[PDB]
Design a protein around this ligand. Sequence first.
Ligand SMILES: [Zn+2]
Ligand SMILES: [Zn+2]
Ligand SMILES: [Zn+2]
Ligand SMILES: [Zn+2]
Ligand SMILES: [Zn+2]
Ligand SMILES: [Zn+2]
Lengths: 446, 446
Amino acid sequence: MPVLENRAAQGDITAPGGARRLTGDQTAALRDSLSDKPAKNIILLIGDGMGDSEITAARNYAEGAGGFFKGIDALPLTGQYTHYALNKKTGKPDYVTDSAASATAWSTGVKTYNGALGVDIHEKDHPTILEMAKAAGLATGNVSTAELQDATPAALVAHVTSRKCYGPSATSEKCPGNALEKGGKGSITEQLLNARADVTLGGGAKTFAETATAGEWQGKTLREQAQARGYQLVSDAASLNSVTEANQQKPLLGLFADGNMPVRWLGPKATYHGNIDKPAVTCTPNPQRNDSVPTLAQMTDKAIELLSKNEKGFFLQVYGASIDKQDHAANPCGQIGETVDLDEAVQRALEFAKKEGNTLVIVTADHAHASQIVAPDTKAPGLTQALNTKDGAVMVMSYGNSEEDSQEHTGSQLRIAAYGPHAANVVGLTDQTDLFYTMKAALGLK
Amino acid sequence: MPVLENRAAQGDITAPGGARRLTGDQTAALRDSLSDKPAKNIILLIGDGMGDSEITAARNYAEGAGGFFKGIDALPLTGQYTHYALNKKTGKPDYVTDSAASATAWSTGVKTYNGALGVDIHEKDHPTILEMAKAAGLATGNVSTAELQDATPAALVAHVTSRKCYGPSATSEKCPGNALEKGGKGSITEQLLNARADVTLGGGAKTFAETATAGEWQGKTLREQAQARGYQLVSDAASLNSVTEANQQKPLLGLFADGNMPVRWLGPKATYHGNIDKPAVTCTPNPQRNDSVPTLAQMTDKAIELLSKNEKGFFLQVYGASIDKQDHAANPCGQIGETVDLDEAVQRALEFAKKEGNTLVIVTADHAHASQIVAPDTKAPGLTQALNTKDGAVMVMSYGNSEEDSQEHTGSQLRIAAYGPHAANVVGLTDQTDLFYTMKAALGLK
Ligand SMILES: [Zn+2]
Ligand SMILES: [Zn+2]
Ligand SMILES: [Zn+2]
Ligand SMILES: [Zn+2]
Ligand SMILES: [Zn+2]
Ligand SMILES: [Zn+2]
């Protein structure tokens, strides 16, 4: 099955046919991309807040308008899906979801309320695709640039009523019903340790410094619990490489930062009348990011290699958190840089899949976001910034949906794209929950 | 080849599987959607400013979040395409296009600068797909809820350096090199009369009141001219319905309004803090629109009847302008209503195509727009409004990208969908110009 080799503009964009991305008819090549054979592996890549506009802005800046993401843009089967959440009290649609509800949706197959992790609107637990994978004998991986306790990674391993229940302290106070000392399954972190995925890599070391309030590991910090349970812990890139295997006897746990992992690019925050009162911006490397912090692609690399040892097959989720976070912060360089970061991850996934031949790879976002690409002389009410793109032309981005310190999600349907066995089930209009069922059937779970 | 019968949520939105839009594997159905046989006809439907946000908002309001547009959402082959224009000076990408430049792109195959109709940056004319269709002996249809002189319909029949050149008067003044008496092909309206499509339906009667300055019909209004040339003139639903034939001996010219055609729904204009300071809004029918003004679907249906008599085939463009126009006015009900207007037209096209068997139907937009779907509690700097949706829940829409009297286009990539012969060529990432060549190839033109 072919990945889209090259869909950059094919010539002189000012000349007839110069901006075409197609070189000929696609029918045959699409037919060739459609298999219903069983998937042995799935790699699900999530870019948080990566709506169609975030992809465009990032392509525009880093690859040029007629450029082409070698990962993100290279998946043959594309569609649009809906990620609306629910009002907890009414059961009716809540048109703009948070990470919690949407991640719960694709990892569980049931809609839920903003803030909910692995539970429906009645607070009843539902099994996650990762838990099911592990039970079928599949190897499991969970990779994240956010705190590991954050909604998206957490949704695969924890069941709680609020996403705020990082550790024992927060749980006892906000999810009393989940608190270990109250007869519940426990905090997000405690539940993560129980879930015992083969590979788990992200930030969020801070919460492992808490002590459990009850259970076999009462009195001991969550970190020591992990150690007492046979987890290999690594804290940087070098130590990550030293790892040789990863399984139920020696699960891998990577903690690469206190909270969220550092972002790659630095640029000023967008600003009111920024495009007209402030110079065009060119992004730069983040000085606060040490080489020894692994990159999403580097984590994705190591996970694929460790997980693929498993003959039955593996399931892996790759989560680029800070597109969304930088979008919230109205920071275009931060936001574009993390989109570029995800694209590298996708490339590693795509080329593994391309050689193995029985791997379904999926790329999407949890929901849309604020950033808009607007005309250079725009006079907008929100925060704006002008950027010098690879094309040698300025692009203006606008963030205009919040007066407070944080720009807001949007509810627009958005792109989902796939390559490999069962990738068809992503085409046309679908819903976020269909995704859970697509993965379930592909791996032949249950 | 199947049209997506139903991709609404399949059951209880609150229960596992209840929000699924799919009932099973799509591979087989998708395989049956891929044919590379000749297209006898092509119906291109354009929603002006109908980006993914606009589609989702219309769906949310009129059909409910888990609802389904029987037209818009029912095309199996989907992808995202880019519509960047060109800076006329530098030849580099201008990241946010207008109607002129983007409609020039698909109808012609070449990128151009904002405001240009059927000419490249060098201002050199290029042939449009409709002129090419007519040349190949095919019937041609050009339908529009906007003024017929407006960029999108005009791009098929006129070549001018500025979209402003409605009639001789404005042409002589702003496109002298195009002015008839300065020896040019003439104004948009004069060129429209020359082009002589079999069917031309829209608004814009005002400009036909103008008199030509030079040429064979000097002194006579373009209305009179159209008549001397053998055009059948209709101006309301009943007269249009009465028409029995439309061809090169008797081309049909429908003029249903002075300017743009009247909007379908009425609602208040969005407002600063409108979602918090003012009551949720329910859209109502426009009490000013006369029943005798044809709808987009009514025009589309009649065009199809008339055009399908040609045994070689037909090309037909159907343009829903007031989505964009209401988006500019920050009027959610206007906007949504026009999206509903478009969805009906798409249905008429889909149902004709589904039984004719050899028709390619395409639905997309020229570019994205301002309107965003945001959380009900949002405090934004721009204009907002709360809506009572079909779900009986409230949706908030935000227009936050302009301090001027008009909301702005956005450069985000956006959905293109297709059904029928050669539809494969829409899947994945493409460019607006690819659409020219896709159509061109599907009709075996040249
Ligand atoms: Zn040139
Ligand atoms: Zn998110
Ligand atoms: Zn967020
Ligand atoms: Zn229920
Ligand atoms: Zn437009
Ligand atoms: Zn517009």
